[PDB]
Symmetry: C3
Subunit: 273 residues, 3 copies
């Protein structure tokens, strides 16, 4: 069965869009999810919705309960998780408003749990070393790409997200260094969400929306909260249209082989006594 | 009004120099400052002095209470914070003994709180994402530069500090990598001091004194505590003269616009419910 | 006297090999070592054996008690610590099965104590800033090199280990970035083991065994637990032969000057009140 966890800036909740809406507060072995899971049906496909920074944004990216979020989506039975994220563009040709279907990351985070297998829980015994060669679901990305071209939206079919610890924005020196590293976009939340998704055997893809060019331009104002907020307001419909047209397609594709493979990868990543 | 917090290796305390000296032990929402604040007047300008690693240097750079230090200077009413720091040179042309008026950093730290807005305190509610495009006060740096040329001291008008976690020094591989990154000087304390200063709406500049060339030279002894200590002893007067001649000038400049701008930046960085 | 702590994948325990075997559970100021120290004699040289991830591998590289391991070896009286480690090759010419006698590292770790001098213990008072220009014992490496050529084994006489936090493997973007950085091999345990060894005045060298090429190859399967495990099984005898032929030689060399120098370096790294 297809069940799609959706994380992020999605006005997808709900009434016209979400049929059979149910609000469910969840307690996981890793503590509390960011907010109540919102459960329902979007065009006859089972979905689960989750606001990353909580009821009206009160928790910093560093202190987001990533373990609880992923574990709670898996336990509802999600086979997919498709997320949305604001990001800074590190390249001229990724303009604010553009979607980037990222395919790689570089971790610049420092204070974040990145495994369920942390020694502390009976649900996750042993040590897990999960492969990250292909951090993002190949077939989901493809649908995301096909669908954005169907929508005639500006879109980059690939890209490397650098995830900074934050909550501060980058210095200029840092911005230029990530440029030399070959990173395309920058955020605060992609790691460890994607790593925990893979540990859980979930197919996970990210819709990244560029909102600013960070601070690397010498003659333009550098990123701020207010500039990200207004760009994000202007452009939020694109990520929303992309998901409404994507979700029909996911629920009408063959998935058993991808999910079987993802399950074995996660299974065989773990070392028991 | 002008009030200048001064952090670091400053024999500025006191008797000839500091008029109207007062020792004040402070308790902030973020715990204890590194040491008692020493309060007084240097050439008719209100100053506040603070030893970064405590009464006779007992705390590692990683465990320095950066939140408490900055918050306590702000609460005394500082409009400026000008700091001094030892550093390793990552370029031949920055010789030991040289001052670098840094203008950028690269964060290599890992275990450090970098925001007052951490979820825990009523004085700092919401999430703060502070811009870091220009981490250091433009007009203060300028005075620092003008004044060092007035002193005929060797000086670099700009520079990128890499801040390592420590307390160890860098491996050679690490030293060469920061070189390829375009870093000029290296230390253990610049981040998060500067980031917390900006969150507080304080104009903050750093006097960086090169003490060694780290370990990148193939045919010279690599950095050690004793080599830094003796270079620092030989060269400590330069940073002291620079501040005595700088402090008159700060207290005689126009500041209201810079501080208004810095206040709005900090104000508009924060997200409430 | 020579006493050699040996950490890692060593079937050196024991009966044919280890004379006068004794199992000793130890309590250090920094908590418990990874496992019981196994104590005895290998070709008439006093050795101490220690399994890094514990009795049948149950602790993640991030949560390994590095402070306890090193401190317990020092307190038994080790003058040397020679370790073995699996690693990913970041260069074509380092083939799986090859030994790399590493000589440098780059730290990509984030959540790890890296000093005994942490403020908390009477055995380690003050702040320690240990030089890392030459993180690995020069004369031990040399014996390791000479001995591998005597064994006619494939061997790289130098190399830069990047130590990632883990427990996940690297993304591809990350793999390529460490390549551009000039790293040769990749692991999860080298830092802070080597840094704590130096703080302790112990001569410390690493036998690194390449087990995989991580994920940088476009047309080969990326690293997994099972691929590392089988390569490691196939190649484990090489690291074992290298140590049996190395250990005679260490116990028959002049060491007093190296250890005196290493002791002064550690001594003079520390700042008391
Ligand atoms: N240059 C940049 N650097 C790092 N991250 C970002 C991001 C990504 N997030 C924006 C956000 C800061 S602004 C914002 C916007 C809406 C709301 Cl409700 C709350 C806050 C952080 O979660 C990271 C966009 N541009 C970035
Ligand atoms: N190559 C290098 N790398 C990192 N940091 C530094 C530093 C900066 N600090 C020196 C200092 C180590 S030596 C010292 C000197 C005086 C006293 Cl009272 C106490 C200790 C650390 O706080 C970082 C200088 N050279 C450096
Ligand atoms: N590409 C790579 N990246 C990071 N580390 C490694 C390592 C080094 N270790 C292997 C090991 C993962 S696989 C393994 C093997 C035997 C046992 Cl008993 C338990 C687990 C981690 O400790 C890091 C090899 N290849 C690596």
């Amino acid at each position: 069965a297809v069940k799609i966890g959706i994380i992020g800036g999605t006005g997808l909740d709900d009434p016209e869009i979400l049929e059979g809406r149910t609000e469910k507060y969840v307690d996981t072995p890793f503590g509390k999810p960011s907010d109540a899971l919102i459960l329902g049906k979007i065009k006859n496909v089972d979905c689960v919705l989750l606001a990353r920074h909580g009821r009206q944004h009160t928790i910093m990216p560093s202190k987001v309960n990533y373990q609880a979020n992923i574990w709670a989506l898996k336990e509802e039975g999600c086979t997919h998780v498709i997320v949305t994220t604001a990001c800074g563009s590190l390249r001229e040709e990724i303009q604010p408003g553009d979607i980037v279907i990222i395919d790689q990351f570089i971790d610049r985070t420092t204070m974040r749990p990145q495994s369920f297998y942390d020694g502390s829980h009976s649900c996750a015994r042993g040590v897990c070393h999960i492969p990250m060669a292909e951090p993002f679901c190949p077939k989901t990305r493809e649908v995301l790409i096909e669908t954005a071209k169907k929508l005639g939206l500006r879109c980059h079919s690939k890209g490397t997200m650098v995830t900074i610890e934050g909550p501060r924005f980058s210095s200029r020196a840092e911005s230029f260094m990530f440029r030399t590293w070959g990173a395309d976009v920058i955020n605060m939340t992609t790691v460890p969400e994607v790593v925990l998704a893979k540990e859980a055997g979930i197919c996970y893809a990210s819709i990244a929306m560029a909102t600013d060019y960070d601070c690397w331009k010498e003659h333009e104002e550098a990123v701020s909260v207010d500039r990200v907020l207004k760009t994000l307001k202007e452009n939020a419909n694109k990520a929303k249209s992309l998901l409404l047209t994507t979700i029909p397609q996911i629920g009408s594709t063959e998935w058993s082989e991808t999910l079987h493979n993802l399950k074995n990868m996660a299974q065989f990543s773990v070392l028991l006594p």
